[PDB]
Structure 1
Amino acid sequence: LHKEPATLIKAIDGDTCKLMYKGQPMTFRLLLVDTPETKHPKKGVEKYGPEASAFTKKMVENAKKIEVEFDKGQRTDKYGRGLAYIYADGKMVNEALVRQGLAKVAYVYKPNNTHEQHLRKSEAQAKKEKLNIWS
């Protein structure tokens, strides 16, 4: 895969944010994970939703560097959102959330699953430590 610089525009929730990419603002959705809902009335404000939002927000706002890393399949979803692994100062936000028990590994659609095993391994650790979503 290949990392590319991006610039934080606005953090939306635990797994969605707006970034300035290649000169254009665009909204991104983290690959292979799912943080709890805080918007959509169908899901309502799910537990740990606000926690995941705060974790992500903090991590991306205090970063000196943000990088996007597309996987090997499609780069956008049906809503026009960019699909990527996002790094804040070299740390993958996707993994950071899973490791804390603030997200579950989800929407694993190949071939966009290069980091699936790494992420699951962290989810297992968060799980055995009964962290947040797993408590």
Structure 2
Amino acid sequence: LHKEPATLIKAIDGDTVKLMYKGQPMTFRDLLVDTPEFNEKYGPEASAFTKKMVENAKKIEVEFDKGQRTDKYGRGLAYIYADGKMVNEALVRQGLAKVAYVYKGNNTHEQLLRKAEAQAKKEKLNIWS
């Protein structure tokens, strides 16, 4: 896979962010994870964690997987990086997202993220507390 440039337009919630990609505004949904909705337990914490990560980054990048790049709602589907650190993984490692929505052929980082989730669960972090 390849990292590509993007710029932050606006934080949205734990697993979605508005980015400018190839010069066009888009909503991106993070591959392979599910954060709680803002209205649910840990939802506010997941949103604040993603907000800080993307706002503080000097460089945002997106990395598409091998399969579909947009979902049925028109959201980009990608791994999002903030100064080289994957947001998707960092949420899972902190117990602020579960590994989820693992569709065959857009799942390159699945085992990396499942290892992060095992660690968060062993630490009883957040959703796993």
The reply to whether TM is greater than 0.5 is yes
2:113 to 96, 119, 122: 119
| Secondary structure, counterpart of 1:87 in structure 2 | strand
2: CA distance, partners of 1:133 / 1:21:
31
Residue deviations 1:79-129 (CA, integer Å, cap 9, x gap) = 000000000000000000000000000000010000000000000000011
1: CA distance, partners of 2:94 / 2:127:
9
2: CA distance, partners of 1:54 / 1:64:
18
Could you say which residue in structure 2 is the equivalent of 1:43? none
Could you say which residue in structure 1 is the equivalent of 2:31? 31
TM-score, length-scaled by structure 1: 0.94
TM-score, length-scaled by structure 2: 0.98
Residue deviations 1:14-51 (CA, integer Å, cap 9, x gap) = 001110000100000000000001xxxxxxxx100000
5+ unaligned residues in a row in structure 1: which ranges?
38-45
| Greater than 6 Å deviation, 4+ residue runs | none
CA RMSD of aligned residues (A): 0.3
2: CA distance, partners of 1:53 / 1:67:
19
Q: Per-residue deviation at 1:62?
A: 0.4
2: CA distance, partners of 1:110 / 1:83:
14
1: CA distance, partners of 2:96 / 2:112:
16
2: CA distance, partners of 1:62 / 1:127:
27
2: CA distance, partners of 1:110 / 1:77:
14
Identity %: 96
